[PDB]
DNA sequence: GTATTGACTTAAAGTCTAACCTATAGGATACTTACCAGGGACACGGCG
């Protein structure tokens, strides 16, 4: 499941290159602690393989998720609760879930709304963060690189 | 030099319209008790 040199996805930092694994015996138990490095924060995260999936670490998603997110980007007829607070909480929880589909839907909806009439700074921050993580994830999804990943995001949002 | 009229242009309003401040309201997971002096004089509570 976990192999050296694999570009594994760890939430909510997106891509996270593995380096190695260490015994790190604690309580007399050589609990395996595999080490990930994320290029965004330049931090190392050591996680246990036995419950690694419990935290939410996932491998690079294939092309099935790629076409899924494209189709979802072409999913119309979205309505939100009237109050701004409720919809903000909903999309923030959607981002926190780490599900690629949920964050993609949040990003697209917020971007279409912002481009519709322009909103605010907090929504802008949410959109920037979510778009950043999505572009990184897609870049590694097809190893298409961050710049070309941003451009493909920019063409596909056009529909 | 000091008495005028007839144009000829000009700033200051005086006002109508538009945008950019301003007073105000609201927001529904759940959260329930904060934080180094002395030296003299006067007044208040205990004890006998």
Swiss-Prot record:
Keywords: Virulence
Gene3D superfamilies linked to this entry: 2.40.10.170, CarD-like, C-terminal domain (1.20.58.1290)
SMART domains: CarD_TRCF
GO process annotations (BP): rRNA transcription
Keyword Transmembrane: no
Family statement: Belongs to the CarD family.
Alphabetized PANTHER family for the sequence: RNA POLYMERASE-BINDING TRANSCRIPTION FACTOR CARD, TRANSCRIPTION FACTOR YDEB-RELATED
Function text: Controls rRNA transcription by binding to the RNA polymerase (RNAP). Required for replication and persistence during infection of mice.
Record protein name field: RNA polymerase-binding transcription factor CarD
Gene encoding the protein: carD
